[PDB]
mmCIF file of C-alpha atoms and ligand atoms in Angstrom:
data_model
loop_
_atom_site.group_PDB
_atom_site.id
_atom_site.type_symbol
_atom_site.label_atom_id
_atom_site.label_comp_id
_atom_site.label_asym_id
_atom_site.label_seq_id
_atom_site.Cartn_x
_atom_site.Cartn_y
_atom_site.Cartn_z
ATOM 1 C CA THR A 5 0.573 5.737 -14.577
ATOM 2 C CA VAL A 6 -0.936 6.611 -11.198
ATOM 3 C CA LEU A 7 1.003 3.692 -9.746
ATOM 4 C CA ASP A 8 4.170 5.265 -11.160
ATOM 5 C CA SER A 9 3.244 8.400 -9.222
ATOM 6 C CA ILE A 10 2.810 6.409 -6.018
ATOM 7 C CA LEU A 11 6.085 4.574 -6.618
ATOM 8 C CA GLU A 12 7.894 7.883 -7.252
ATOM 9 C CA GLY A 13 6.980 8.878 -3.689
ATOM 10 C CA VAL A 14 8.213 5.536 -2.410
ATOM 11 C CA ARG A 15 11.447 5.916 -4.347
ATOM 12 C CA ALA A 16 11.909 9.390 -2.833
ATOM 13 C CA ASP A 17 11.333 8.089 0.679
ATOM 14 C CA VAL A 18 13.803 5.267 0.102
ATOM 15 C CA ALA A 19 16.416 7.570 -1.393
ATOM 16 C CA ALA A 20 16.159 9.943 1.553
ATOM 17 C CA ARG A 21 16.590 7.038 3.996
ATOM 18 C CA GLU A 22 19.605 5.763 2.035
ATOM 19 C CA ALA A 23 21.191 9.224 2.411
ATOM 20 C CA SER A 24 21.296 8.692 6.195
ATOM 21 C CA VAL A 25 21.833 4.942 6.291
ATOM 22 C CA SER A 26 24.067 3.865 3.427
ATOM 23 C CA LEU A 27 23.709 0.676 1.482
ATOM 24 C CA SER A 28 26.891 -0.554 3.182
ATOM 25 C CA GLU A 29 25.422 0.235 6.613
ATOM 26 C CA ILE A 30 22.040 -1.360 5.973
ATOM 27 C CA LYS A 31 23.764 -4.501 4.687
ATOM 28 C CA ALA A 32 25.811 -4.602 7.890
ATOM 29 C CA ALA A 33 22.632 -4.175 9.949
ATOM 30 C CA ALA A 34 20.920 -6.947 7.972
ATOM 31 C CA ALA A 35 23.834 -9.356 8.449
ATOM 32 C CA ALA A 36 23.939 -8.493 12.148
ATOM 33 C CA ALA A 37 20.259 -9.274 12.681
ATOM 34 C CA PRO A 38 19.158 -12.634 14.071
ATOM 35 C CA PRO A 39 18.546 -15.018 11.127
ATOM 36 C CA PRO A 40 15.119 -14.951 9.488
ATOM 37 C CA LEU A 41 12.612 -17.604 10.509
ATOM 38 C CA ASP A 42 11.663 -20.417 8.123
ATOM 39 C CA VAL A 43 8.510 -18.816 6.754
ATOM 40 C CA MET A 44 7.838 -21.700 4.346
ATOM 41 C CA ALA A 45 7.812 -24.135 7.261
ATOM 42 C CA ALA A 46 5.297 -21.932 9.098
ATOM 43 C CA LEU A 47 3.076 -21.768 5.994
ATOM 44 C CA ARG A 48 3.143 -25.561 5.673
ATOM 45 C CA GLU A 49 1.770 -26.162 9.174
ATOM 46 C CA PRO A 50 -1.627 -27.890 9.458
ATOM 47 C CA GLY A 51 -4.683 -25.648 9.388
ATOM 48 C CA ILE A 52 -5.353 -22.395 7.587
ATOM 49 C CA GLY A 53 -2.751 -19.836 8.608
ATOM 50 C CA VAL A 54 -3.980 -16.498 9.885
ATOM 51 C CA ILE A 55 -1.727 -13.607 8.918
ATOM 52 C CA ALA A 56 -2.870 -10.796 11.192
ATOM 53 C CA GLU A 57 -2.006 -7.254 10.145
ATOM 54 C CA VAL A 58 -0.761 -4.270 12.140
ATOM 55 C CA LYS A 59 -1.921 -0.979 10.601
ATOM 56 C CA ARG A 60 -3.299 2.491 11.376
ATOM 57 C CA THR A 70 -4.847 4.812 16.056
ATOM 58 C CA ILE A 71 -2.350 2.169 17.178
ATOM 59 C CA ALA A 72 -0.124 3.716 19.843
ATOM 60 C CA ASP A 73 1.501 0.359 20.592
ATOM 61 C CA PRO A 74 1.952 -1.935 17.573
ATOM 62 C CA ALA A 75 3.936 -4.397 19.711
ATOM 63 C CA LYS A 76 1.029 -4.888 22.108
ATOM 64 C CA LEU A 77 -1.264 -5.514 19.157
ATOM 65 C CA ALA A 78 1.155 -8.032 17.656
ATOM 66 C CA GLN A 79 1.310 -9.830 21.019
ATOM 67 C CA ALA A 80 -2.471 -10.174 21.041
ATOM 68 C CA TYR A 81 -2.219 -11.596 17.526
ATOM 69 C CA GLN A 82 0.311 -14.220 18.609
ATOM 70 C CA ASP A 83 -1.744 -15.068 21.731
ATOM 71 C CA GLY A 84 -4.724 -15.679 19.466
ATOM 72 C CA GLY A 85 -2.826 -18.190 17.322
ATOM 73 C CA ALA A 86 -1.773 -16.034 14.365
ATOM 74 C CA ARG A 87 0.717 -17.773 12.063
ATOM 75 C CA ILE A 88 2.461 -14.568 10.893
ATOM 76 C CA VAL A 89 2.188 -10.880 11.786
ATOM 77 C CA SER A 90 2.014 -8.441 8.878
ATOM 78 C CA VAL A 91 3.327 -4.932 9.600
ATOM 79 C CA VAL A 92 2.504 -2.078 7.260
ATOM 80 C CA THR A 93 5.561 0.179 7.084
ATOM 81 C CA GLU A 94 4.201 2.470 4.364
ATOM 82 C CA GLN A 95 4.029 6.003 5.744
ATOM 83 C CA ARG A 96 2.002 8.138 3.351
ATOM 84 C CA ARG A 97 -1.367 6.364 3.584
ATOM 85 C CA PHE A 98 -1.174 3.980 6.549
ATOM 86 C CA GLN A 99 1.036 6.018 8.862
ATOM 87 C CA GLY A 100 3.332 3.024 9.336
ATOM 88 C CA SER A 101 7.094 3.104 9.799
ATOM 89 C CA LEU A 102 10.142 0.887 10.161
ATOM 90 C CA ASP A 103 10.007 1.628 13.888
ATOM 91 C CA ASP A 104 6.822 -0.532 13.924
ATOM 92 C CA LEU A 105 8.728 -3.462 12.470
ATOM 93 C CA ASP A 106 11.374 -3.266 15.214
ATOM 94 C CA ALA A 107 8.702 -3.056 17.900
ATOM 95 C CA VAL A 108 6.752 -6.013 16.534
ATOM 96 C CA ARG A 109 9.864 -8.129 15.982
ATOM 97 C CA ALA A 110 10.841 -7.791 19.658
ATOM 98 C CA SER A 111 7.328 -8.639 20.841
ATOM 99 C CA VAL A 112 6.569 -11.903 19.028
ATOM 100 C CA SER A 113 8.299 -15.182 18.159
ATOM 101 C CA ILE A 114 6.281 -15.898 14.994
ATOM 102 C CA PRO A 115 7.383 -14.677 11.562
ATOM 103 C CA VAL A 116 6.942 -11.034 10.637
ATOM 104 C CA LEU A 117 5.938 -9.821 7.170
ATOM 105 C CA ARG A 118 6.934 -6.354 5.970
ATOM 106 C CA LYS A 119 3.933 -4.965 4.086
ATOM 107 C CA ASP A 120 4.987 -2.039 1.915
ATOM 108 C CA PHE A 121 5.750 -1.074 -1.689
ATOM 109 C CA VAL A 122 9.070 -2.822 -2.165
ATOM 110 C CA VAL A 123 10.660 -1.675 -5.424
ATOM 111 C CA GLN A 124 14.434 -1.587 -4.947
ATOM 112 C CA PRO A 125 17.121 -3.776 -3.365
ATOM 113 C CA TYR A 126 17.854 -1.309 -0.569
ATOM 114 C CA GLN A 127 14.417 -2.063 0.894
ATOM 115 C CA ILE A 128 15.175 -5.775 0.962
ATOM 116 C CA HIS A 129 18.299 -5.362 3.085
ATOM 117 C CA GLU A 130 16.386 -2.774 5.116
ATOM 118 C CA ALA A 131 13.537 -5.218 5.784
ATOM 119 C CA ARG A 132 16.030 -7.830 7.009
ATOM 120 C CA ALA A 133 17.920 -5.328 9.162
ATOM 121 C CA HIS A 134 14.627 -4.556 10.875
ATOM 122 C CA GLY A 135 13.794 -8.189 11.590
ATOM 123 C CA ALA A 136 11.420 -9.132 8.770
ATOM 124 C CA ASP A 137 11.182 -12.817 7.805
ATOM 125 C CA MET A 138 8.839 -12.210 4.888
ATOM 126 C CA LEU A 139 8.532 -9.361 2.421
ATOM 127 C CA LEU A 140 5.747 -8.284 0.033
ATOM 128 C CA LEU A 141 6.486 -8.117 -3.712
ATOM 129 C CA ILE A 142 3.686 -6.738 -5.897
ATOM 130 C CA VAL A 143 3.641 -8.103 -9.443
ATOM 131 C CA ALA A 144 1.585 -5.156 -10.743
ATOM 132 C CA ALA A 145 4.282 -2.766 -9.493
ATOM 133 C CA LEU A 146 7.281 -4.631 -10.840
ATOM 134 C CA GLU A 147 8.327 -5.347 -14.406
ATOM 135 C CA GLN A 148 9.551 -8.928 -14.718
ATOM 136 C CA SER A 149 13.257 -8.034 -14.690
ATOM 137 C CA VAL A 150 12.846 -6.221 -11.354
ATOM 138 C CA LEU A 151 10.508 -8.827 -9.871
ATOM 139 C CA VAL A 152 13.018 -11.582 -10.514
ATOM 140 C CA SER A 153 15.932 -9.577 -9.139
ATOM 141 C CA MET A 154 13.939 -8.615 -6.024
ATOM 142 C CA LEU A 155 12.702 -12.183 -5.423
ATOM 143 C CA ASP A 156 16.193 -13.631 -5.758
ATOM 144 C CA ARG A 157 17.704 -11.063 -3.386
ATOM 145 C CA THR A 158 14.910 -11.656 -0.862
ATOM 146 C CA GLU A 159 15.620 -15.389 -0.891
ATOM 147 C CA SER A 160 19.406 -14.876 -0.783
ATOM 148 C CA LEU A 161 18.920 -13.234 2.647
ATOM 149 C CA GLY A 162 16.846 -16.162 3.878
ATOM 150 C CA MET A 163 13.530 -14.322 3.624
ATOM 151 C CA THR A 164 10.356 -15.432 1.872
ATOM 152 C CA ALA A 165 8.562 -13.263 -0.655
ATOM 153 C CA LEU A 166 4.794 -12.960 -0.542
ATOM 154 C CA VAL A 167 4.284 -12.402 -4.249
ATOM 155 C CA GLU A 168 1.018 -10.538 -4.690
ATOM 156 C CA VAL A 169 -1.056 -10.948 -7.839
ATOM 157 C CA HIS A 170 -4.399 -9.611 -9.017
ATOM 158 C CA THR A 171 -4.823 -11.493 -12.322
ATOM 159 C CA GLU A 172 -4.095 -14.857 -13.935
ATOM 160 C CA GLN A 173 -1.423 -13.176 -16.060
ATOM 161 C CA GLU A 174 0.290 -11.747 -12.963
ATOM 162 C CA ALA A 175 0.166 -15.243 -11.455
ATOM 163 C CA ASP A 176 1.923 -16.677 -14.505
ATOM 164 C CA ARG A 177 4.529 -13.941 -14.198
ATOM 165 C CA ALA A 178 4.965 -14.778 -10.508
ATOM 166 C CA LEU A 179 5.421 -18.491 -11.238
ATOM 167 C CA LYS A 180 7.970 -17.786 -13.982
ATOM 168 C CA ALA A 181 9.976 -15.595 -11.571
ATOM 169 C CA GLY A 182 10.198 -18.556 -9.202
ATOM 170 C CA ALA A 183 7.559 -17.545 -6.631
ATOM 171 C CA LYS A 184 6.951 -20.102 -3.841
ATOM 172 C CA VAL A 185 4.188 -18.138 -2.139
ATOM 173 C CA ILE A 186 1.503 -16.366 -4.114
ATOM 174 C CA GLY A 187 -0.995 -13.973 -2.565
ATOM 175 C CA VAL A 188 -4.187 -12.879 -4.287
ATOM 176 C CA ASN A 189 -5.299 -9.284 -3.755
ATOM 177 C CA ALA A 190 -8.823 -8.520 -4.980
ATOM 178 C CA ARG A 191 -8.188 -4.769 -5.072
ATOM 179 C CA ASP A 192 -6.756 -3.146 -8.201
ATOM 180 C CA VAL A 198 -12.483 -4.986 -6.330
ATOM 181 C CA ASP A 199 -12.686 -8.259 -8.258
ATOM 182 C CA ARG A 200 -14.841 -10.181 -5.793
ATOM 183 C CA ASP A 201 -14.026 -13.528 -7.399
ATOM 184 C CA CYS A 202 -10.281 -13.042 -7.746
ATOM 185 C CA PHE A 203 -8.981 -15.914 -5.623
ATOM 186 C CA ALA A 204 -11.207 -18.493 -7.350
ATOM 187 C CA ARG A 205 -10.247 -17.231 -10.808
ATOM 188 C CA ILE A 206 -6.565 -17.708 -9.960
ATOM 189 C CA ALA A 207 -5.997 -20.369 -7.267
ATOM 190 C CA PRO A 208 -6.890 -23.437 -9.385
ATOM 191 C CA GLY A 209 -4.172 -22.578 -11.910
ATOM 192 C CA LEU A 210 -1.344 -22.705 -9.360
ATOM 193 C CA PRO A 211 0.921 -25.742 -8.909
ATOM 194 C CA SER A 212 -0.168 -27.650 -5.811
ATOM 195 C CA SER A 213 3.295 -27.091 -4.335
ATOM 196 C CA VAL A 214 2.943 -23.290 -4.328
ATOM 197 C CA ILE A 215 1.515 -21.715 -1.145
ATOM 198 C CA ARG A 216 -1.759 -19.846 -1.746
ATOM 199 C CA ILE A 217 -2.725 -16.793 0.295
ATOM 200 C CA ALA A 218 -6.010 -14.891 0.151
ATOM 201 C CA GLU A 219 -5.147 -11.299 1.028
ATOM 202 C CA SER A 220 -8.597 -9.741 0.719
ATOM 203 C CA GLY A 221 -12.138 -9.871 2.009
ATOM 204 C CA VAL A 222 -11.777 -11.743 5.296
ATOM 205 C CA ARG A 223 -14.429 -10.392 7.662
ATOM 206 C CA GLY A 224 -15.182 -13.457 9.730
ATOM 207 C CA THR A 225 -14.980 -17.215 9.972
ATOM 208 C CA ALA A 226 -17.266 -17.758 6.980
ATOM 209 C CA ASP A 227 -14.913 -15.860 4.633
ATOM 210 C CA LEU A 228 -11.834 -17.707 5.919
ATOM 211 C CA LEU A 229 -13.602 -21.046 5.432
ATOM 212 C CA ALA A 230 -14.691 -20.069 1.923
ATOM 213 C CA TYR A 231 -11.064 -19.348 0.993
ATOM 214 C CA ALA A 232 -9.999 -22.589 2.689
ATOM 215 C CA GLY A 233 -12.553 -24.521 0.611
ATOM 216 C CA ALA A 234 -11.098 -22.879 -2.500
ATOM 217 C CA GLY A 235 -7.572 -24.023 -1.668
ATOM 218 C CA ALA A 236 -6.089 -21.204 0.422
ATOM 219 C CA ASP A 237 -3.248 -22.151 2.768
ATOM 220 C CA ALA A 238 -3.442 -18.869 4.680
ATOM 221 C CA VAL A 239 -5.449 -15.658 4.783
ATOM 222 C CA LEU A 240 -4.462 -12.091 5.594
ATOM 223 C CA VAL A 241 -6.776 -10.235 7.976
ATOM 224 C CA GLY A 242 -6.409 -6.609 9.105
ATOM 225 C CA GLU A 243 -9.553 -5.124 10.549
ATOM 226 C CA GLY A 244 -11.878 -5.541 12.097
ATOM 227 C CA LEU A 245 -9.565 -7.428 14.429
ATOM 228 C CA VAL A 246 -8.742 -4.056 15.969
ATOM 229 C CA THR A 247 -12.274 -2.621 15.788
ATOM 230 C CA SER A 248 -13.580 -5.740 17.512
ATOM 231 C CA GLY A 249 -11.924 -4.321 20.636
ATOM 232 C CA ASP A 250 -10.508 -7.762 21.348
ATOM 233 C CA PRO A 251 -7.914 -8.687 18.704
ATOM 234 C CA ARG A 252 -6.705 -11.792 20.554
ATOM 235 C CA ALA A 253 -10.198 -13.268 20.696
ATOM 236 C CA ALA A 254 -10.946 -12.196 17.124
ATOM 237 C CA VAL A 255 -7.819 -13.913 15.875
ATOM 238 C CA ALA A 256 -8.548 -16.980 18.015
ATOM 239 C CA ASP A 257 -12.002 -17.268 16.420
ATOM 240 C CA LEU A 258 -10.506 -17.226 12.916
ATOM 241 C CA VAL A 259 -7.683 -19.597 13.841
ATOM 242 C CA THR A 260 -10.250 -22.134 15.020
ATOM 243 C CA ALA A 261 -12.702 -21.419 12.177
ATOM 244 C CA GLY A 262 -14.877 -24.385 11.256
ATOM 245 C CA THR A 263 -14.431 -26.097 14.610
ATOM 246 C CA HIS A 264 -17.422 -24.265 16.095
ATOM 247 C CA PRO A 265 -19.934 -25.123 17.133
ATOM 248 C CA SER A 266 -18.034 -28.011 18.736
ATOM 249 C CA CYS A 267 -19.390 -31.546 18.358
ATOM 250 C CA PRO A 268 -21.007 -32.895 21.559
ATOM 251 C CA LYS A 269 -18.537 -34.587 23.915
HETATM 252 O O1 3RG B 1 -3.097 -3.865 4.032
HETATM 253 C C1 3RG B 1 -3.899 -3.111 3.576
HETATM 254 O O2 3RG B 1 -4.735 -2.368 4.423
HETATM 255 C C2 3RG B 1 -3.760 -2.687 2.112
HETATM 256 N N1 3RG B 1 -2.627 -3.414 1.552
HETATM 257 C C3 3RG B 1 -1.301 -2.807 1.380
HETATM 258 C C4 3RG B 1 -0.753 -1.718 2.340
HETATM 259 C C5 3RG B 1 0.656 -1.125 2.099
HETATM 260 C C6 3RG B 1 1.521 -1.613 0.901
HETATM 261 C C7 3RG B 1 0.971 -2.703 -0.054
HETATM 262 C C8 3RG B 1 -0.432 -3.288 0.191
HETATM 263 C C9 3RG B 1 -0.992 -4.366 -0.746
HETATM 264 O O3 3RG B 1 -1.754 -5.179 -0.331
HETATM 265 O O4 3RG B 1 -0.347 -4.571 -1.967
#
């Protein structure tokens, strides 16, 4: 029920935004935006994809996203949730203008307005959380996301949520260990069709963690800090992007 309380706040924030920017207007803004990038194609590229996250401290999310791209990130995740992470849609605009790689909107997405809104602000990918969405809503949200040319990162925490995600038509499934189930990805990944993209969203501290997820079948990992804390996010991302290739074999 606590999640209902959190979602009530999200629904209030969304409703207040819709009062200023109507559904008709946000649809017009979404249609006007440059088309979304082919996120599936990016996720199918060789190597483990690094999805580097912008969060909050950060006076210039665009500059951070640029460092992420320079380091070889596959996708930039932008947290737009205000109440805990001090993110905003403004961050999505800033990041979108700064990088050429796909951009994921990371937020609690619970109603269709937010889908059009994500697109209007340049997102290529959008987070859908199975634990937050009853199946009827999950399916509706996934279909609308795809109808706009975006890809849903469908986040699960249990085998049952994974089954729900598959039934809804998910193409990309992310495993979040936090409700922390430290063996979440391994409990879930093997059960997925080989054709579905697997993302480990939790517990990536360094190259060893990325490699461990890679060895368990991950196609990409999400990393937030301590890319920032490192003081050198480009280098930190570069190290993860090239994980397993160091030390280099003698030449
Ligand atoms: O990124 C993090 O630091 C914590 N993750 C989130 C932050 C805002 C909205 C949803 C999530 C989630 O993973 O379902």
